[PDB]
Enzyme design. Structure first.
Site, PDB file in Angstrom:
ATOM      1  N   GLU A   1      87.407 -45.378  14.206  1.00 12.97           N
ATOM      2  CA  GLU A   1      86.783 -46.107  13.088  1.00 12.97           C
ATOM      3  C   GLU A   1      87.354 -47.523  12.938  1.00 12.97           C
ATOM      4  O   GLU A   1      87.501 -48.058  11.848  1.00 12.97           O
ATOM      5  CB  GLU A   1      86.792 -45.277  11.795  1.00 12.97           C
TER       6      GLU A   1
ATOM      7  N   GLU B   1      80.860 -38.495  14.992  1.00  6.49           N
ATOM      8  CA  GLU B   1      81.207 -37.855  13.733  1.00  6.49           C
ATOM      9  C   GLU B   1      79.978 -37.916  12.839  1.00  6.49           C
ATOM     10  O   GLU B   1      79.355 -38.979  12.704  1.00  6.49           O
ATOM     11  CB  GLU B   1      82.300 -38.580  12.933  1.00  6.49           C
TER      12      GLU B   1
END
Ligand SMILES: [Cl-]
Ligand code: NA
Length: 465
Positions: free
Chosen positions: A169, A288
Protein backbone atom coordinates in the site's frame (compact mmCIF):
# COMPACT_ATOMS: atom_id res chain seq x y z
CA UNK A 1 14.21 -19.09 -17.39
CA UNK A 2 11.58 -18.42 -14.72
CA UNK A 3 10.26 -20.20 -11.65
CA UNK A 4 6.61 -19.28 -12.45
CA UNK A 5 6.71 -18.42 -16.16
CA UNK A 6 3.12 -19.49 -16.92
CA UNK A 7 0.35 -16.90 -16.68
CA UNK A 8 -2.14 -18.69 -14.46
CA UNK A 9 -5.27 -17.45 -12.82
CA UNK A 10 -6.14 -17.94 -9.22
CA UNK A 11 -8.18 -17.17 -6.18
CA UNK A 12 -5.86 -16.00 -3.44
CA UNK A 13 -5.85 -14.55 0.00
CA UNK A 14 -3.73 -12.66 2.50
CA UNK A 15 -2.36 -13.58 5.90
CA UNK A 16 0.00 -11.37 7.87
CA UNK A 17 1.04 -13.70 10.72
CA UNK A 18 2.91 -16.43 8.71
CA UNK A 19 6.26 -15.08 9.91
CA UNK A 20 5.68 -15.08 13.69
CA UNK A 21 3.06 -17.64 14.75
CA UNK A 22 3.44 -21.32 15.70
CA UNK A 23 3.74 -24.31 13.37
CA UNK A 24 0.20 -25.32 14.29
CA UNK A 25 -1.19 -21.91 13.37
CA UNK A 26 0.80 -21.73 10.10
CA UNK A 27 -0.23 -25.27 9.18
CA UNK A 28 -3.88 -24.35 9.81
CA UNK A 29 -3.77 -21.37 7.46
CA UNK A 30 -2.03 -23.30 4.67
CA UNK A 31 -4.20 -26.42 5.06
CA UNK A 32 -7.27 -24.17 5.02
CA UNK A 33 -6.05 -22.57 1.80
CA UNK A 34 -5.44 -25.98 0.21
CA UNK A 35 -8.85 -27.28 1.31
CA UNK A 36 -10.57 -24.17 -0.09
CA UNK A 37 -8.70 -24.19 -3.43
CA UNK A 38 -6.79 -20.99 -2.62
CA UNK A 39 -3.59 -21.28 -4.68
CA UNK A 40 -1.69 -18.10 -3.69
CA UNK A 41 -1.23 -16.47 -0.30
CA UNK A 42 0.11 -12.92 0.07
CA UNK A 43 2.16 -12.63 3.27
CA UNK A 44 4.39 -10.14 5.03
CA UNK A 45 8.11 -10.70 4.78
CA UNK A 46 9.04 -7.93 7.21
CA UNK A 47 9.23 -7.21 10.93
CA UNK A 48 10.99 -3.85 11.30
CA UNK A 49 12.08 -2.21 14.56
CA UNK A 50 13.01 -3.47 18.02
CA UNK A 51 9.63 -2.67 19.59
CA UNK A 52 7.64 -4.44 16.89
CA UNK A 53 9.91 -7.48 17.04
CA UNK A 54 9.72 -7.57 20.87
CA UNK A 55 5.92 -7.38 20.70
CA UNK A 56 5.80 -10.58 18.64
CA UNK A 57 8.90 -12.14 20.25
CA UNK A 58 10.09 -12.52 16.66
CA UNK A 59 13.06 -10.76 15.06
CA UNK A 60 13.71 -9.99 11.41
CA UNK A 61 15.03 -6.41 11.14
CA UNK A 62 15.24 -4.94 14.63
CA UNK A 63 18.00 -2.43 13.76
CA UNK A 64 19.85 -1.32 10.64
CA UNK A 65 22.16 -4.10 9.51
CA UNK A 66 20.76 -6.59 12.05
CA UNK A 67 18.93 -9.40 10.24
CA UNK A 68 17.75 -11.81 12.93
CA UNK A 69 17.80 -11.81 16.71
CA UNK A 70 19.97 -9.12 18.32
CA UNK A 71 22.72 -9.92 20.74
CA UNK A 72 21.58 -10.12 24.34
CA UNK A 73 18.16 -11.73 23.80
CA UNK A 74 17.19 -15.29 24.74
CA UNK A 75 14.08 -17.32 23.91
CA UNK A 76 13.21 -15.28 20.81
CA UNK A 77 11.96 -16.45 17.46
CA UNK A 78 13.69 -15.63 14.18
CA UNK A 79 11.27 -14.40 11.54
CA UNK A 80 13.38 -15.84 8.74
CA UNK A 81 13.05 -19.27 10.33
CA UNK A 82 9.28 -18.77 10.57
CA UNK A 83 9.16 -17.69 6.93
CA UNK A 84 11.32 -20.71 6.09
CA UNK A 85 8.78 -22.97 7.80
CA UNK A 86 5.87 -21.27 5.98
CA UNK A 87 7.61 -21.69 2.64
CA UNK A 88 8.40 -25.35 3.30
CA UNK A 89 4.85 -26.11 4.37
CA UNK A 90 3.36 -24.16 1.44
CA UNK A 91 5.65 -26.16 -0.86
CA UNK A 92 4.38 -29.43 0.57
CA UNK A 93 0.77 -28.33 0.03
CA UNK A 94 1.19 -26.80 -3.42
CA UNK A 95 0.54 -23.19 -2.32
CA UNK A 96 2.46 -20.28 -3.86
CA UNK A 97 3.40 -17.13 -1.97
CA UNK A 98 3.67 -13.41 -2.70
CA UNK A 99 6.14 -11.97 -0.18
CA UNK A 100 5.83 -8.25 0.59
CA UNK A 101 9.06 -6.53 1.62
CA UNK A 102 8.01 -3.43 3.65
CA UNK A 103 4.77 -1.86 4.91
CA UNK A 104 3.57 1.62 3.98
CA UNK A 105 1.82 1.62 7.36
CA UNK A 106 3.28 1.44 10.86
CA UNK A 107 2.18 -2.14 11.55
CA UNK A 108 5.30 -4.29 11.89
CA UNK A 109 7.35 -1.07 11.78
CA UNK A 110 6.94 -0.01 8.19
CA UNK A 111 8.49 2.88 6.35
CA UNK A 112 8.25 5.12 9.39
CA UNK A 113 10.46 2.76 11.37
CA UNK A 114 13.12 3.19 8.70
CA UNK A 115 12.63 6.95 8.85
CA UNK A 116 13.19 6.88 12.60
CA UNK A 117 16.35 4.75 12.28
CA UNK A 118 17.83 7.41 9.97
CA UNK A 119 16.72 10.52 11.80
CA UNK A 120 14.09 11.62 9.30
CA UNK A 121 10.93 13.51 10.05
CA UNK A 122 8.39 12.50 7.39
CA UNK A 123 7.06 9.17 6.14
CA UNK A 124 7.91 10.01 2.57
CA UNK A 125 11.57 10.50 3.45
CA UNK A 126 11.66 6.71 3.05
CA UNK A 127 11.67 7.14 -0.74
CA UNK A 128 14.23 9.98 -0.83
CA UNK A 129 17.00 9.47 1.73
CA UNK A 130 19.77 7.38 0.15
CA UNK A 131 20.64 5.89 3.53
CA UNK A 132 17.11 4.55 3.89
CA UNK A 133 17.09 3.24 0.34
CA UNK A 134 20.43 1.53 1.02
CA UNK A 135 19.11 -0.16 4.16
CA UNK A 136 16.00 -1.40 2.33
CA UNK A 137 18.31 -2.79 -0.37
CA UNK A 138 20.45 -4.53 2.27
CA UNK A 139 17.35 -6.10 3.82
CA UNK A 140 15.99 -7.26 0.46
CA UNK A 141 19.37 -8.68 -0.51
CA UNK A 142 19.53 -10.59 2.77
CA UNK A 143 16.11 -12.08 2.17
CA UNK A 144 16.67 -13.00 -1.51
CA UNK A 145 19.99 -14.69 -0.70
CA UNK A 146 18.63 -16.47 2.36
CA UNK A 147 18.90 -20.26 2.34
CA UNK A 148 15.73 -21.83 3.70
CA UNK A 149 16.84 -23.95 6.66
CA UNK A 150 14.17 -26.59 6.02
CA UNK A 151 14.35 -26.99 2.22
CA UNK A 152 18.05 -26.15 1.77
CA UNK A 153 17.06 -23.99 -1.23
CA UNK A 154 17.86 -20.26 -1.42
CA UNK A 155 14.84 -17.98 -1.79
CA UNK A 156 16.23 -16.86 -5.19
CA UNK A 157 15.74 -20.42 -6.47
CA UNK A 158 12.48 -21.28 -4.67
CA UNK A 159 9.46 -21.77 -6.97
CA UNK A 160 7.06 -21.69 -4.04
CA UNK A 161 7.70 -17.93 -4.00
CA UNK A 162 5.63 -16.55 -6.86
CA UNK A 163 6.58 -12.90 -6.56
CA UNK A 164 8.41 -10.28 -4.55
CA UNK A 165 6.36 -7.20 -3.79
CA UNK A 166 8.09 -3.94 -3.05
CA UNK A 167 5.78 -2.32 -0.49
CA UNK A 168 2.31 -2.91 0.91
CA UNK A 169 0.00 0.00 0.00
CA UNK A 170 2.79 2.44 -0.77
CA UNK A 171 1.76 6.07 -0.88
CA UNK A 172 3.63 9.35 -1.33
CA UNK A 173 1.14 12.11 -0.58
CA UNK A 174 3.93 14.72 -0.59
CA UNK A 175 4.45 14.27 -4.37
CA UNK A 176 1.16 14.26 -6.24
CA UNK A 177 2.97 14.26 -9.60
CA UNK A 178 3.60 10.55 -9.00
CA UNK A 179 7.26 10.97 -9.94
CA UNK A 180 8.82 10.15 -6.56
CA UNK A 181 7.17 6.72 -6.50
CA UNK A 182 7.89 6.06 -10.18
CA UNK A 183 11.59 6.69 -9.54
CA UNK A 184 11.65 4.59 -6.35
CA UNK A 185 9.77 1.69 -7.92
CA UNK A 186 12.03 1.74 -10.98
CA UNK A 187 15.12 1.69 -8.76
CA UNK A 188 13.92 -1.03 -6.40
CA UNK A 189 12.33 -3.33 -8.94
CA UNK A 190 15.45 -3.10 -11.13
CA UNK A 191 17.56 -3.84 -8.07
CA UNK A 192 15.54 -6.93 -7.19
CA UNK A 193 15.79 -8.20 -10.77
CA UNK A 194 19.55 -7.68 -10.59
CA UNK A 195 19.72 -10.05 -7.63
CA UNK A 196 16.97 -12.47 -8.69
CA UNK A 197 16.10 -12.81 -12.37
CA UNK A 198 13.85 -15.79 -11.60
CA UNK A 199 10.89 -14.26 -9.78
CA UNK A 200 8.07 -11.93 -10.72
CA UNK A 201 8.19 -8.46 -9.17
CA UNK A 202 5.18 -6.32 -8.36
CA UNK A 203 4.63 -3.11 -6.48
CA UNK A 204 1.92 -3.91 -3.93
CA UNK A 205 0.12 -0.54 -4.20
CA UNK A 206 -3.64 -0.02 -3.94
CA UNK A 207 -3.99 1.00 -7.62
CA UNK A 208 -4.83 4.69 -7.42
CA UNK A 209 -5.24 6.62 -10.65
CA UNK A 210 -3.95 10.11 -11.43
CA UNK A 211 -6.51 11.96 -13.61
CA UNK A 212 -6.69 9.69 -16.64
CA UNK A 213 -8.96 10.96 -19.38
CA UNK A 214 -12.32 9.32 -19.13
CA UNK A 215 -11.78 7.65 -15.74
CA UNK A 216 -13.94 9.00 -12.91
CA UNK A 217 -15.34 7.26 -9.80
CA UNK A 218 -18.78 5.70 -9.71
CA UNK A 219 -21.26 8.15 -8.25
CA UNK A 220 -18.67 10.89 -7.80
CA UNK A 221 -17.49 9.26 -4.56
CA UNK A 222 -13.85 8.77 -3.51
CA UNK A 223 -12.53 11.14 -6.17
CA UNK A 224 -9.18 11.09 -4.32
CA UNK A 225 -8.66 7.49 -5.51
CA UNK A 226 -8.88 8.69 -9.16
CA UNK A 227 -7.15 12.10 -9.02
CA UNK A 228 -3.59 11.42 -7.87
CA UNK A 229 -4.00 12.52 -4.24
CA UNK A 230 -1.93 9.65 -2.86
CA UNK A 231 1.05 10.21 -5.17
CA UNK A 232 0.36 6.91 -6.98
CA UNK A 233 0.15 7.00 -10.79
CA UNK A 234 -0.82 3.40 -11.41
CA UNK A 235 -0.46 3.53 -15.19
CA UNK A 236 3.08 4.95 -14.92
CA UNK A 237 4.03 2.30 -12.35
CA UNK A 238 2.65 -0.50 -14.51
CA UNK A 239 4.70 0.79 -17.44
CA UNK A 240 7.98 0.12 -15.57
CA UNK A 241 9.78 -2.66 -17.43
CA UNK A 242 10.97 -4.39 -14.27
CA UNK A 243 7.39 -4.63 -12.90
CA UNK A 244 5.72 -7.82 -14.19
CA UNK A 245 2.09 -7.37 -13.14
CA UNK A 246 -0.16 -4.73 -11.67
CA UNK A 247 -1.70 -4.80 -8.21
CA UNK A 248 -4.74 -3.05 -6.84
CA UNK A 249 -6.71 -3.17 -3.61
CA UNK A 250 -10.39 -2.42 -2.90
CA UNK A 251 -12.00 -1.12 0.33
CA UNK A 252 -14.96 1.11 -0.48
CA UNK A 253 -15.93 1.44 3.18
CA UNK A 254 -12.52 2.86 4.06
CA UNK A 255 -12.44 5.22 1.12
CA UNK A 256 -15.59 7.33 1.43
CA UNK A 257 -18.04 5.30 -0.65
CA UNK A 258 -21.65 5.03 0.54
CA UNK A 259 -22.99 1.52 1.28
CA UNK A 260 -25.64 1.78 -1.42
CA UNK A 261 -22.74 2.19 -3.88
CA UNK A 262 -20.18 -0.32 -2.54
CA UNK A 263 -20.99 -2.98 -5.13
CA UNK A 264 -20.99 -0.71 -8.17
CA UNK A 265 -18.02 1.41 -7.07
CA UNK A 266 -15.92 -1.69 -6.62
CA UNK A 267 -17.17 -3.12 -9.91
CA UNK A 268 -16.19 0.03 -11.81
CA UNK A 269 -12.85 0.11 -9.96
CA UNK A 270 -12.20 -3.48 -11.10
CA UNK A 271 -13.25 -2.86 -14.68
CA UNK A 272 -11.21 0.35 -14.84
CA UNK A 273 -8.08 -1.45 -13.61
CA UNK A 274 -8.51 -4.31 -16.09
CA UNK A 275 -9.06 -1.79 -18.88
CA UNK A 276 -5.89 0.14 -18.03
CA UNK A 277 -3.89 -3.07 -17.55
CA UNK A 278 -4.95 -4.01 -21.08
CA UNK A 279 -3.93 -0.57 -22.38
CA UNK A 280 -0.40 -1.18 -21.07
CA UNK A 281 -0.48 -4.89 -21.89
CA UNK A 282 0.33 -6.49 -18.57
CA UNK A 283 -1.51 -8.82 -16.18
CA UNK A 284 -3.32 -7.51 -13.12
CA UNK A 285 -4.23 -8.93 -9.70
CA UNK A 286 -6.88 -7.64 -7.30
CA UNK A 287 -4.67 -8.54 -4.35
CA UNK A 288 -6.74 -7.22 -1.44
CA UNK A 289 -10.46 -6.57 -1.15
CA UNK A 290 -12.93 -6.57 1.67
CA UNK A 291 -16.23 -5.36 3.14
CA UNK A 292 -16.52 -5.36 6.98
CA UNK A 293 -18.91 -7.91 8.38
CA UNK A 294 -20.79 -5.20 10.23
CA UNK A 295 -21.50 -3.18 7.09
CA UNK A 296 -25.28 -2.96 6.37
CA UNK A 297 -24.95 -4.90 3.09
CA UNK A 298 -24.94 -8.52 1.89
CA UNK A 299 -21.19 -9.06 1.70
CA UNK A 300 -21.35 -12.39 -0.10
CA UNK A 301 -23.37 -10.90 -2.98
CA UNK A 302 -20.85 -8.06 -3.39
CA UNK A 303 -17.94 -10.48 -3.33
CA UNK A 304 -19.75 -12.61 -5.94
CA UNK A 305 -20.00 -9.60 -8.28
CA UNK A 306 -16.38 -8.59 -7.79
CA UNK A 307 -15.07 -12.11 -8.39
CA UNK A 308 -17.33 -12.45 -11.47
CA UNK A 309 -15.82 -9.29 -12.95
CA UNK A 310 -12.22 -10.28 -12.32
CA UNK A 311 -12.85 -13.64 -13.96
CA UNK A 312 -15.03 -12.54 -16.86
CA UNK A 313 -12.88 -9.51 -17.79
CA UNK A 314 -9.63 -11.44 -17.77
CA UNK A 315 -7.99 -10.44 -14.51
CA UNK A 316 -5.41 -12.93 -13.35
CA UNK A 317 -6.29 -13.13 -9.67
CA UNK A 318 -8.66 -12.06 -6.96
CA UNK A 319 -7.38 -12.21 -3.38
CA UNK A 320 -9.59 -11.42 -0.42
CA UNK A 321 -8.40 -9.88 2.80
CA UNK A 322 -8.07 -12.11 4.77
CA UNK A 323 -7.77 -15.81 5.58
CA UNK A 324 -7.16 -17.10 9.09
CA UNK A 325 -7.03 -20.47 10.82
CA UNK A 326 -6.96 -21.90 14.32
CA UNK A 327 -5.98 -19.58 17.16
CA UNK A 328 -3.83 -20.04 20.25
CA UNK A 329 -3.19 -18.17 23.44
CA UNK A 330 -4.66 -14.71 23.59
CA UNK A 331 -5.28 -14.78 19.81
CA UNK A 332 -8.09 -17.31 20.06
CA UNK A 333 -11.82 -16.66 19.96
CA UNK A 334 -14.69 -18.65 21.46
CA UNK A 335 -14.85 -20.97 18.42
CA UNK A 336 -11.13 -21.66 18.54
CA UNK A 337 -10.13 -19.47 15.59
CA UNK A 338 -7.75 -16.59 15.30
CA UNK A 339 -10.11 -13.69 16.09
CA UNK A 340 -11.89 -11.50 13.58
CA UNK A 341 -10.19 -8.34 14.79
CA UNK A 342 -11.02 -6.14 11.76
CA UNK A 343 -14.32 -7.61 10.49
CA UNK A 344 -12.73 -9.07 7.34
CA UNK A 345 -11.71 -12.54 8.52
CA UNK A 346 -12.75 -15.56 6.51
CA UNK A 347 -12.02 -19.06 7.82
CA UNK A 348 -12.70 -22.52 6.39
CA UNK A 349 -16.14 -22.76 8.00
CA UNK A 350 -19.88 -22.91 7.18
CA UNK A 351 -20.22 -19.28 6.15
CA UNK A 352 -21.64 -18.12 2.84
CA UNK A 353 -18.38 -16.32 2.14
CA UNK A 354 -16.36 -19.51 2.57
CA UNK A 355 -18.67 -21.37 0.23
CA UNK A 356 -18.36 -18.59 -2.34
CA UNK A 357 -14.55 -18.78 -2.19
CA UNK A 358 -14.58 -22.55 -2.64
CA UNK A 359 -16.78 -22.21 -5.75
CA UNK A 360 -14.76 -19.45 -7.33
CA UNK A 361 -11.45 -21.23 -6.65
CA UNK A 362 -12.56 -24.07 -8.92
CA UNK A 363 -13.60 -21.56 -11.59
CA UNK A 364 -10.23 -19.81 -11.61
CA UNK A 365 -8.18 -22.97 -11.11
CA UNK A 366 -9.56 -25.18 -13.88
CA UNK A 367 -12.21 -23.12 -15.62
CA UNK A 368 -14.89 -25.23 -13.93
CA UNK A 369 -17.71 -22.74 -14.72
CA UNK A 370 -20.90 -24.04 -13.21
CA UNK A 371 -22.07 -20.62 -11.94
CA UNK A 372 -25.85 -20.57 -11.70
CA UNK A 373 -28.22 -17.70 -12.36
CA UNK A 374 -28.93 -15.99 -9.02
CA UNK A 375 -30.42 -12.81 -7.62
CA UNK A 376 -29.73 -11.39 -4.20
CA UNK A 377 -30.66 -8.45 -2.06
CA UNK A 378 -27.61 -6.30 -1.34
CA UNK A 379 -29.41 -3.67 0.77
CA UNK A 380 -31.06 -4.00 3.12
CA UNK A 381 -29.18 -6.71 4.86
CA UNK A 382 -31.28 -9.61 6.15
CA UNK A 383 -32.78 -8.89 9.55
CA UNK A 384 -32.29 -5.13 9.47
CA UNK A 385 -34.57 -2.59 11.11
CA UNK A 386 -35.59 -0.06 8.46
CA UNK A 387 -37.59 3.16 8.45
CA UNK A 388 -38.43 6.17 6.29
CA UNK A 389 -37.13 5.71 2.73
CA UNK A 390 -34.64 2.90 2.06
CA UNK A 391 -32.52 2.63 -1.07
CA UNK A 392 -33.09 -1.02 -1.98
CA UNK A 393 -30.24 -2.60 -3.97
CA UNK A 394 -30.29 -6.03 -5.58
CA UNK A 395 -27.84 -7.94 -7.75
CA UNK A 396 -28.72 -10.03 -10.77
CA UNK A 397 -26.13 -12.69 -11.60
CA UNK A 398 -26.88 -13.69 -15.20
CA UNK A 399 -24.56 -16.43 -16.43
CA UNK A 400 -26.91 -17.96 -19.03
CA UNK A 401 -27.46 -14.55 -20.67
CA UNK A 402 -31.24 -15.07 -20.41
CA UNK A 403 -32.22 -12.39 -17.86
CA UNK A 404 -35.31 -10.34 -18.68
CA UNK A 405 -36.46 -8.28 -15.70
CA UNK A 406 -36.47 -7.95 -11.92
CA UNK A 407 -39.33 -7.44 -9.46
CA UNK A 408 -39.59 -7.02 -5.68
CA UNK A 409 -42.64 -7.85 -3.62
CA UNK A 410 -43.43 -6.64 -0.11
CA UNK A 411 -46.89 -7.37 1.34
CA UNK A 412 -49.33 -6.48 -1.51
CA UNK A 413 -46.90 -4.14 -3.29
CA UNK A 414 -45.12 -5.16 -6.50
CA UNK A 415 -42.16 -3.01 -7.49
CA UNK A 416 -41.00 -3.49 -11.03
CA UNK A 417 -41.65 -0.41 -13.13
CA UNK A 418 -39.45 1.85 -10.99
CA UNK A 419 -36.54 -0.59 -10.57
CA UNK A 420 -33.55 0.97 -12.34
CA UNK A 421 -30.34 -0.62 -13.55
CA UNK A 422 -27.48 1.13 -11.76
CA UNK A 423 -24.70 -0.71 -13.60
CA UNK A 424 -22.97 -4.12 -13.40
CA UNK A 425 -26.21 -6.02 -12.76
CA UNK A 426 -27.03 -3.93 -9.67
CA UNK A 427 -30.59 -2.62 -9.55
CA UNK A 428 -32.28 -0.24 -7.19
CA UNK A 429 -35.30 1.78 -6.19
CA UNK A 430 -36.50 3.84 -3.21
CA UNK A 431 -38.85 2.07 -0.81
CA UNK A 432 -40.95 4.44 1.31
CA UNK A 433 -41.43 2.17 4.30
CA UNK A 434 -44.22 4.34 5.71
CA UNK A 435 -46.38 2.70 3.04
CA UNK A 436 -46.14 -0.54 5.00
CA UNK A 437 -47.18 -1.13 8.61
CA UNK A 438 -44.56 -1.35 11.32
CA UNK A 439 -43.38 -4.86 12.12
CA UNK A 440 -41.61 -7.77 10.52
CA UNK A 441 -42.05 -8.25 6.78
CA UNK A 442 -40.60 -10.55 4.15
CA UNK A 443 -39.21 -8.90 1.03
CA UNK A 444 -39.18 -11.07 -2.06
CA UNK A 445 -36.87 -10.65 -5.03
CA UNK A 446 -37.80 -12.33 -8.30
CA UNK A 447 -35.39 -12.49 -11.21
CA UNK A 448 -37.38 -13.24 -14.35
CA UNK A 449 -35.20 -15.17 -16.80
CA UNK A 450 -36.36 -16.83 -19.97
CA UNK A 451 -38.02 -20.06 -18.86
CA UNK A 452 -37.39 -19.72 -15.11
CA UNK A 453 -37.70 -17.50 -12.10
CA UNK A 454 -34.93 -17.22 -9.52
CA UNK A 455 -35.64 -15.90 -6.06
CA UNK A 456 -34.23 -14.39 -2.91
CA UNK A 457 -35.96 -13.24 0.23
CA UNK A 458 -35.02 -11.38 3.37
CA UNK A 459 -36.79 -10.29 6.50
CA UNK A 460 -36.80 -6.67 7.61
CA UNK A 461 -38.44 -4.92 10.58
CA UNK A 462 -40.17 -1.66 9.70
CA UNK A 463 -39.86 0.70 12.66
CA UNK A 464 -41.32 4.08 11.74
CA UNK A 465 -43.00 4.44 15.15
CL1 LIG B 1 1.06 7.35 3.69
NA1 NA C 1 -3.45 -10.75 6.02
Amino acid sequence: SMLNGKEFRFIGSNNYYMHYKSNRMIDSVLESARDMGIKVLRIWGFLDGESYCRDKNTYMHPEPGVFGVPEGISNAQNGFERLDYTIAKAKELGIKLIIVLVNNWDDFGGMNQYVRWFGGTHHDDFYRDERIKEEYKKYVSFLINHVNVYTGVPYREEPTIMAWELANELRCETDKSGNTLVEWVKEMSSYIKSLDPNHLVAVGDEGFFSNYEGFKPYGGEAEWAYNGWSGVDWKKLLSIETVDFGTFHLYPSHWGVSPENYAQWGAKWIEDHIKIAKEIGKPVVLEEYGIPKSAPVNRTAIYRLWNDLVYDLGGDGAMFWMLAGIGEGSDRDERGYYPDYDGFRIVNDDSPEAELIREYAKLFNTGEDIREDTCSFILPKDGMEIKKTVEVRAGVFDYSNTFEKLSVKVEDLVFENEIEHLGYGIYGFDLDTTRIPDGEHEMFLEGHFQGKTVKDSIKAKVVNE
